[PDB]
Write a protein that binds this ligand. Structure first.
Ligand SMILES: [Fe+2]
Ligand SMILES: [Fe+2]
Ligand SMILES: [Fe+2]
Ligand SMILES: [Fe+2]
Lengths: 288, 297, 288, 288
């Protein structure tokens, strides 16, 4: 069974120019817009997902991530984790239900790396636009823009990664799948964490600047859809970070590109299938 | 967090001839031979898996599946599941550790459909043939035969699927992802169950005969690998049931082929990502009647 | 250099319902419509080709093919082929320019198999919808329906293959790439002919009835696109002959499907790269 | 039909060390070793080609290309071609048959760009290691190393591209498919020439030094086989130049890597289907 924290639920990013962000994400990446709220944010979800949002856009003075939340099994599991997080030593805040459109209340806290993380149990299930009975074999959203299948994860840059990991593995029920060993002596300079059987649901890399966003990732269906996302990136003059390639760490076949506002995002596919009884894989710092 | 029942752990299948059985599986299917015991069972595992075995072959007079087992999180989860299966009403058998090469003890029990299912917490980790430090994405093994990535599931034919469903969802922590609705006077004619975020770890289709194994399934990296297995099956004059195709009742692109003994197997890739909070999808009987899992055809 | 007969240029097929055949080819197959003449024929071209047309549909009381034409290098070449065909003994018919929209004059003759074949040197180049300067690798057109890349060939059914092989090899400048051997008593049941370095530009199979059309063929980019074609066909209730599969006698990974009128067509990719100096491959009858 | 110059026949390149070259091309690139003569050259051909060789390496003081030969339709075409070169103002050397293993006489000349070009009509057809009757659906050779399907072309660096262009399109019956403009006072900083219906069998870029080799290219089956070439390269610790990506000029999805001696080679796939009746595509200097 999949219990406790189930999967990445949503990332709310900051954009410099709303209209430019709404067009980029809706028409280039191919996310499906589900709503806009009186606070100025626009709600987006991957076409094949079932919940109302997985990526929220918001205008502000700088690029970067406001926060990253995960959906948990149920409301009981929400209070339980709230209590454990507190018991651990973190100050928990409770954003009331509805503060976000179609979203129940969420338990928020801040990590030693300085990132804002959320936990919620309820969020509307608008579905994927396909019938629940004999779902058709083909659908048009599938090909609107890049059109990724799900918010896969995010990679964060922050200072106290060790304290970070203990929180996730000792309290949130994640496990280390991959890690990058320090140049020497000691710790991990990068950690890939999973709360399921995916290579990872979130990853953290050691860095001084607190709360920095490296990237939010979207899973694609094949290597060819990655080449395709590449072509669509050029057609739309999207600044690309690292063209299509393989990731030693994760084995992901990916493309790193930039938002019109500087936020790095990723469209990849590939990876093995780890489970909680697995020992993590490690990479020497010189190979990182 | 992945808890309780984790994943398909092994299937023990019956081959009419042990020798030709080892060649096909290791040379055509591409599974990795990992050991052979006193009873003369020969063990295999997909190259990318980490545990000693996922597929065990035993010589016999009849083809089919002896049993199908799931790996559970830990010893404590195992004793608990054993306990809950008792409390629900099923009788439990306890197989001693070592009875299977490199495996801890397992909890066995028969379903109302007749198939024997097993649960275990321990099985030796032998690795995936690749270094644990600075690992490459693959090695020569990925190109030995079809070389599937993992034992994905199995589909079984049995008489009391409504009860099997209850057992798997209420006791074992599985959830329904998809089903085939009754011809009209509704009920369920087929069920696809997941204990993870996979479309299904196991499936059952209503059927008179008890203990029927429709097929065991192995996951391939991509659609091209599926095309490649088809070329490999052709070359080895393997008897293919239904060539590469868009499955249907599961979104998988697959090939159903036969064992030299008559055991059907599946090489496929693709699927969506369901989670425990999702509601299942449904297929109307007529639609299903056109599918690959229909008792007829 | 590619000389004489260059490539399949057009196929004219009969449909029982004009407007019902139009929606299908433009929306299911995804061909691009380029025009409609007074005879009530409508023209199509794969999106990546440059010529005004490659497939023409005419309303008639019976399905099948009217003719199949090949484009040749130039007028000189066309007049030469015209003479050469007659010197072999074949009666030649000359169709005037503009008889077909945007098409120059063609040379038409009938084979022993009962099919009509055409040669033409001129047809307006309308382009592939992409610019001539700094062209992108593709555009929206590539994802409208199946959207094949080119009219690849056709397979014809007819009675005098031996003589048909003769004409193509000795008059038209083609060569045998592959052949299916007759049961034991050796002659040729099937014939795959090339006038380029493609596995084949046309193919014939010995059959007692004359002028029969087995299928016109359309090329896709990848196995992934063949799989996609299968999905689009399923979504549109297209009657599929034989599902996605690896055809031995060509290596192509294809799908045979049916037009709403009964005209079979194929979408496939793959094969090898043969040349005029290569000896042909052979298949035994049973294997066939 | 394919007449005149059919396709790229062979490339002889120099390797600082025979043994390491023999290992790389045989076991990493996956070329099939066909032979070795008394001058110290070892011979290779792609597994799927049919002729005895497409790539010949020699131990020398430097790394570059000695010569690159094109196969022609027949002997008459060879004499024909040689005579027109001379009538063009090019002296031609005549290498006697046998000189190169399993290879007949060959016409050789030099381009104004300093490179040596060969033309030949005969080379022993060894086959592709698969039967000529009921060819197997696949062989183990197909997965031995990267294992390209054919010597697709080569790109040369040298001066006076304009001169070379004209020899090719005016004497060898090649034609321009794509060009790269110069900033202004427009001439071609780069040209892509085809003598078939391939995007190109050869290309040249304006360079001060003459006789330079930029890279020899090998064709792959699909976008996934390239990613695979990527992985195999990494596994063998081969230095990769420009990671897997979409080209633009040719549309080819490729990866450039280096020889254990410095020669750049390529393994790609993809591209359209041009013919001699097509007008070349153009790229402004800014994109190049
Ligand atoms: Fe990532
Ligand atoms: Fe299955
Ligand atoms: Fe065909
Ligand atoms: Fe190239």
């Amino acid at each position: 069974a999949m219990t406790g924290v189930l999967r990445p639920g949503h990332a709310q990013v900051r954009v410099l120019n709303l209209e430019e962000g709404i067009h980029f994400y809706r028409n280039v990446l191919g996310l499906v817009e589900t709503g806009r709220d009186d606070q100025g944010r626009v709600y987006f979800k991957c076409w094949d997902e079932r919940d109302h949002s997985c990526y929220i856009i918001r205008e502000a003075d700088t690029a970067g991530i406001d926060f990253f939340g995960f959906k948990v099994l149920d409301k009981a599991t929400l209070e339980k984790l709230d209590a454990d997080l507190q018991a651990y030593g973190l100050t928990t805040t409770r954003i009331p239900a509805g503060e976000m459109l179609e979203t129940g209340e969420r338990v928020r806290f801040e990590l030693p790396s300085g990132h804002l993380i959320e936990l919620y149990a309820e969020k509307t299930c608008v579905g994927n636009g396909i019938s629940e009975v004999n779902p058709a074999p083909w659908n048009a959203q599938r090909e609107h823009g890049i059109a990724p299948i799900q918010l896969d994860h995010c990679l964060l840059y922050g200072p106290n990664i060790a304290e970070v990991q203990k929180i996730f593995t000792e309290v949130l029920g994640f496990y280390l799948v991959e890690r990058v060993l320090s140049p020497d002596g000691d710790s991990d300079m990068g950690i890939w964490l999973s709360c399921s059987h995916k290579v990872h649901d979130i990853a953290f890399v050691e860095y001084p600047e607190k709360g920095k966003l490296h990237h939010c990732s979207f899973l694609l269906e094949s290597w060819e859809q990655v080449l395709r996302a590449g072509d669509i990136m050029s057609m739309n003059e999207v600044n690309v970070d690292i063209g299509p390639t393989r990731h030693g760490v994760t084995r992901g076949c990916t493309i790193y590109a930039w938002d019109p506002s500087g936020n790095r995002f990723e469209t990849f596919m590939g990876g093995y299938h780890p489970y909680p009884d697995y020992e993590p894989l490690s990479w020497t710092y010189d190979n990182f």
